[PDB]
Design a protein around this ligand. Sequence first.
Ligand SMILES: Oc1cc2ccccc2cc1O
Length: 222
Amino acid sequence: ATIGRISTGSKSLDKLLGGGIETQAITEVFGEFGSGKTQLAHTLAVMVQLPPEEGGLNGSVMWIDTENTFRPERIREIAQNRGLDPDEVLKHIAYARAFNSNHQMLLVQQAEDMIKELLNTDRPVKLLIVDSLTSHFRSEYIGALAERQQKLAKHLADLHRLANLYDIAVFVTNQVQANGGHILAHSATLRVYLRKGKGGKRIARLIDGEAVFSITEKGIED
Ligand SMILES: Oc1cc2ccccc2cc1O
């Protein structure tokens, strides 16, 4: 398949990304608590449902939530302010809460079943969100970094296999703050550092110019 792009909702961020986040890729956004990573995830879950003329892929979404941070009412707001029907937008987001890191790993295998079911339809899965990808692994493997890296590596390999095999954009979030971080090392296809700036602006930079955007009723925008 050709590489598809999903607009983030922000012209500035899209330019930094070359048009949007890519299918057949894992995009990792990392930054401190409150930097806006989950807002970007919510926005992408709407944007992907637009037609290509508007920066989407007419796609369905799968969302693995590890922190109980998915907000359907926020999806509704973004959809209503992106000219979509909120009920339809929510009906094309498959949502699961990961209870721990092992269940999170099983959910990726389960996601493949729904991906296959939708593959030849008019609304194939085009976006798989894992938010937060690292939070369970971090809390469960304190003092056991070597084992944590083994399990994370297999998890990321599973996510790569889905992105490439089924032409999906995988979007993952990673909280990194004071003294913290191996990030995801070199595993993602693309690392985006997100931070707060003056006056509530958010600033994004590719790791390995900068885009500037705001969080609004449209999700994010310039
Ligand atoms: O109904 C489902 C929703 C999911 C969401 C995320 C990952 C896997 C899922 C599997 C389902 O059957």
